[PDB]
Amino acid sequence: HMTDLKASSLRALKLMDLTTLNDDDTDEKVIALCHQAKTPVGNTAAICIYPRFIPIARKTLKEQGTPEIRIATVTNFPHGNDDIDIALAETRAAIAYGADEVDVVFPYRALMAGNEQVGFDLVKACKEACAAANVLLKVIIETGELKDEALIRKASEISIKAGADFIKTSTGKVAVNATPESARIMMEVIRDMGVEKTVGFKPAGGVRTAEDAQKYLAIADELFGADWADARHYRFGASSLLASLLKALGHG
Numbered sequence: 001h002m003t004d005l006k007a008s009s010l011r012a013l014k015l016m017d018l019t020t021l022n023d024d025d026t027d028e029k030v031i032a033l034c035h036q037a038k039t040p041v042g043n044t045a046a047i048c049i050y051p052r053f054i055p056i057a058r059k060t061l062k063e064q065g066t067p068e069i070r071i072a073t074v075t076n077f078p079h080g081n082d083d084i085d086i087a088l089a090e091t092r093a094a095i096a097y098g099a100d101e102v103d104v105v106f107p108y109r110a111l112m113a114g115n116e117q118v119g120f121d122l123v124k125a126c127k128e129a130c131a132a133a134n135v136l137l138k139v140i141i142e143t144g145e146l147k148d149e150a151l152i153r154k155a156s157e158i159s160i161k162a163g164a165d166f167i168k169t170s171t172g173k174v175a176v177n178a179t180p181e182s183a184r185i186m187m188e189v190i191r192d193m194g195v196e197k198t199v200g201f202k203p204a205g206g207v208r209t210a211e212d213a214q215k216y217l218a219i220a221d222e223l224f225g226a227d228w229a230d231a232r233h234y235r236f237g238a239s240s241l242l243a244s245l246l247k248a249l250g251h252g
């Protein structure tokens with residue numbers, strides 16, 4: 001018997017960027033994560049790991065017959081510093097390791113201190129490098145630190161103007177990460193700029209249960225209709241959600 005929660009949970013699984021971003025990460029932990037991404041009901045959209053683990057992850061995904069699971073990574077992370085040369089160097093290294101996607105942290109503290117230009121320039125530099133390599137760029141704005149709706153909107157806007165392919169709520173590394181309100185605000189920016197075709201949305205950080213995921217897809221479906229949230233336009237950033245989705249589906 002189909003239910004709303006089973007329908008949402010299978011969608012969320014297929015849209016997941018299955019993540020491990022810990023100081024104690026090892027090859028063994030990344031290999032296990034790759035195996036976890038290959039589920040009895042389908043594959044996650046991607047994995048997300050630190051750049052140094054990309055080569056061993058690629059090998060693992062290939063050997064288990066899921067070369068289509070994308071490899072995302074993070075740069076300028078988690079602090080979102082305003083040194084463009086460092087963020088760009090990290091992005092270029094992520095590309096060289098073999099990333100399919102880079103999730104870069106926007107210089108949100110700089111924006112809070114009144115500097116809008118540095119975020120534009122940082123995202124644009126990283127976008128140029130990624131685009132040349134056929135790599136997607138997601139931009140993490142850190143909604144939990146920005147806090148104010150106007151600042152969330154402005155960081156989203158600047159990121160889109162600079163070429164972001166996705167806007168992502170959070171690093172998962174601060175006290176407040178994804179919220180339904182933050183998701184609505186960011187998706188409203190996509191709407192207001194008319195960039196539904198070219199910009200996806202990624203809630204991240206603290207999305208732990210199947211019910212949590214359902215709340216985020218409900219907002220996407222309201223705003224853009226239920227066909228918009230495909231893997232080019234929607235991802236879940238989550239280290240600890242997949243088991244909950246599989247349980248909801250009876251395969252966990």
Ligand SMILES: *[C@H](O)C[C@H](O)[C@H](O)COP(=O)(O)O
Pocket residue numbers: 019021048073074103170171172173204205206207236237238239240
């Ligand atoms: C971007 O890769 C950030 C990740 O989506 C988050 O770190 C995941 O947060 P948790 O699921 O670990 O809370």
